[PDB]
Amino acid sequence: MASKRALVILAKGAEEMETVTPVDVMRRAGIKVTVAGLAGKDPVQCSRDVVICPDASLEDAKKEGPYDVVVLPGGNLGAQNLSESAAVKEILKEQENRKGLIAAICAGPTALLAHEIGFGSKVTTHPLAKDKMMNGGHYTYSENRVEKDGLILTSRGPGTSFEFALAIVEALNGKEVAAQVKAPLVLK
Amino acid sequence: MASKRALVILAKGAEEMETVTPVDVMRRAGIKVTVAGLAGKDPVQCSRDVVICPDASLEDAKKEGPYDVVVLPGGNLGAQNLSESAAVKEILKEQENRKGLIAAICAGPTALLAHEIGFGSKVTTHPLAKDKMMNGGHYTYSENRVEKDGLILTSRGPGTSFEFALAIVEALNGKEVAAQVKAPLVLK
């Protein structure tokens, strides 16, 4: 069986912890992860000024799908960039149409609202992003640290990144792989 | 009063989560953080293949000190590179001589052993790095998630990175700043 594949969409102003922790944990799980730069191949200046070099442009990575999961990091400005992108809209609608997992953390879920993805689901967000996500009442809000309603998997903040990433691993590779990846991490 | 300053030494094979989370949290605390590349100015390939562009070479950053804290990420190969570096030895011995904080996580503390820093302290490490750290009995081992004995601050693994970074913030900027930085993170 072929390894599962993840697309992580990296925009200027993304929360770097919410990019790096899921990428790292998914690679620990033996998932083939592509960090794709929204704007192109060039390095991306994250919210706290960490600069990450993407594996590929989104323009190129989006031709190499499909992916088992599409991951949207948070950060207020990163999520706003994801929300404004027609390319992101197309990728998310294709993923939803093929019944593939979509995972978003912190402010990231607000890009689901912008692109009309997953309406009628239970979702969580960062507390400060709740009102934006809930505009129109298209989702039902949850305060769970990770929330999964079918193929929409959401989480709250930097401090839920491990839980979020391990939930992706469990969904793709099963509970046993998630448990094995978790143990060396020294999680509380 | 001038802002505190942190030097984060980034080597090939570093654990990217243990680099990014402390950098981000320290910047949230208003610390001026320099991510310095051990090998030079070029991008650094971390343990799980995240590629980070340093702010400066170590060669340049080490002339712009002193720093309030010197931070050593983990990752087995990153820590081995830190342990082999004469430049790292000199920086750590200068920091120790000026009674400045030194903070190391996961395998990172083993570079303290290599450079003969902080002998006679209580330290923790990743469980798998204990035997290396304890060779010769020069430290006393702790299983605390974060351990601080004077100016030597150590921690265990990816899942202790927030605790580690917030301990640095508390040491530099006080408990109230650490508490204020912590709340928006959604930590368990």
Side-chain angles (χ1 to χ4, degrees):
Chain A
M1 282 285 102
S3 296
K4 304 289 183 182
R5 298 172 76 227
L7 179 66
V8 176
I9 309 182
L10 176 55
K12 188 174 180 185
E15 225 301 329
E16 43 269 76
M17 299 184 283
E18 297 169 8
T19 303
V20 171
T21 293
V23 167
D24 181 321
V25 170
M26 288 188 292
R27 289 180 171 152
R28 287 170 177 261
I31 298 165
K32 183 65 174 308
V33 180
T34 301
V35 178
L38 183 63
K41 308 176 172 179
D42 290 343
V44 180
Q45 186 186 356
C46 295
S47 69
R48 275 67 182 178
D49 285 339
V50 174
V51 175
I52 298 173
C53 298
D55 301 319
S57 64
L58 187 61
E59 183 172 354
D60 288 340
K62 74 193 203 320
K63 305 185 301 233
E64 292 183 328
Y67 295 89
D68 297 287
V69 63
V70 178
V71 181
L72 309 182
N76 183 30
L77 307 181
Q80 290 178 36
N81 285 321
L82 296 173
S83 292
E84 291 179 351
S85 167
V88 172
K89 187 182 307 293
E90 178 180 54
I91 291 163
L92 295 175
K93 288 175 182 294
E94 178 177 344
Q95 186 71 342
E96 185 182 38
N97 285 341
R98 66 183 294 275
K99 308 181 187 179
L101 190 63
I102 297 171
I105 182 164
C106 205
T110 68
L112 305 178
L113 173 61
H115 299 311
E116 300 187 336
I117 306 293
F119 287 2
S121 301
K122 262 69 69 163
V123 300
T124 194
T125 68
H126 193 276
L128 295 168
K130 173 175 177 278
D131 291 350
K132 179 180 268 277
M133 187 69 175
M134 289 299 291
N135 184 34
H138 296 291
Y139 307 94
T140 296
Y141 201 73
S142 173
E143 294 178 46
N144 286 326
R145 292 174 63 77
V146 178
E147 186 55 80
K148 185 179 184 294
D149 192 3
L151 299 162
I152 300 292
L153 192 164
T154 57
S155 188
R156 309 203 73 185
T160 69
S161 293
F162 282 114
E163 291 153 86
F164 172 70
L166 289 166
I168 297 168
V169 172
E170 178 170 345
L172 262 54
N173 291 349
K175 188 167 186 165
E176 183 58 20
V177 169
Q180 291 300 118
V181 169
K182 177 177 181 179
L185 300 176
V186 201
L187 285 167
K188 185 121 61 164
Chain B
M1 282 285 102
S3 296
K4 304 289 183 182
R5 298 172 76 227
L7 179 66
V8 176
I9 309 182
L10 176 55
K12 188 174 180 185
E15 225 301 329
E16 43 269 76
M17 299 184 283
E18 297 169 8
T19 303
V20 171
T21 293
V23 167
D24 181 321
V25 170
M26 288 188 292
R27 289 180 171 152
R28 287 170 177 261
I31 298 165
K32 183 65 174 308
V33 180
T34 301
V35 178
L38 183 63
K41 308 176 172 179
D42 290 343
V44 180
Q45 186 186 356
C46 295
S47 69
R48 275 67 182 178
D49 285 339
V50 174
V51 175
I52 298 173
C53 298
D55 301 319
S57 64
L58 187 61
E59 183 172 354
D60 288 340
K62 74 193 203 320
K63 305 185 301 233
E64 292 183 328
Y67 295 89
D68 297 287
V69 63
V70 178
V71 181
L72 309 182
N76 183 30
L77 307 181
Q80 290 178 36
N81 285 321
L82 296 173
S83 292
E84 291 179 351
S85 167
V88 172
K89 187 182 307 293
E90 178 180 54
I91 291 163
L92 295 175
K93 288 175 182 294
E94 178 177 344
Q95 186 71 342
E96 185 182 38
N97 285 341
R98 66 183 294 275
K99 308 181 187 179
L101 190 63
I102 297 171
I105 182 164
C106 205
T110 68
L112 305 178
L113 173 61
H115 299 311
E116 300 187 336
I117 306 293
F119 287 2
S121 301
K122 262 69 69 163
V123 300
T124 194
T125 68
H126 193 276
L128 295 168
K130 173 175 177 278
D131 291 350
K132 179 180 268 277
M133 187 69 175
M134 289 299 291
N135 184 34
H138 296 291
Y139 307 94
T140 296
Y141 201 73
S142 173
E143 294 178 46
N144 286 326
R145 292 174 63 77
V146 178
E147 186 55 80
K148 185 179 184 294
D149 192 3
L151 299 162
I152 300 292
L153 192 164
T154 57
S155 188
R156 309 203 73 185
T160 69
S161 293
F162 282 114
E163 291 153 86
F164 172 70
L166 289 166
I168 297 168
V169 172
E170 178 170 345
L172 262 54
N173 291 349
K175 188 167 186 165
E176 183 58 20
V177 169
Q180 291 300 118
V181 169
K182 177 177 181 179
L185 300 176
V186 201
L187 285 167
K188 185 121 61 164

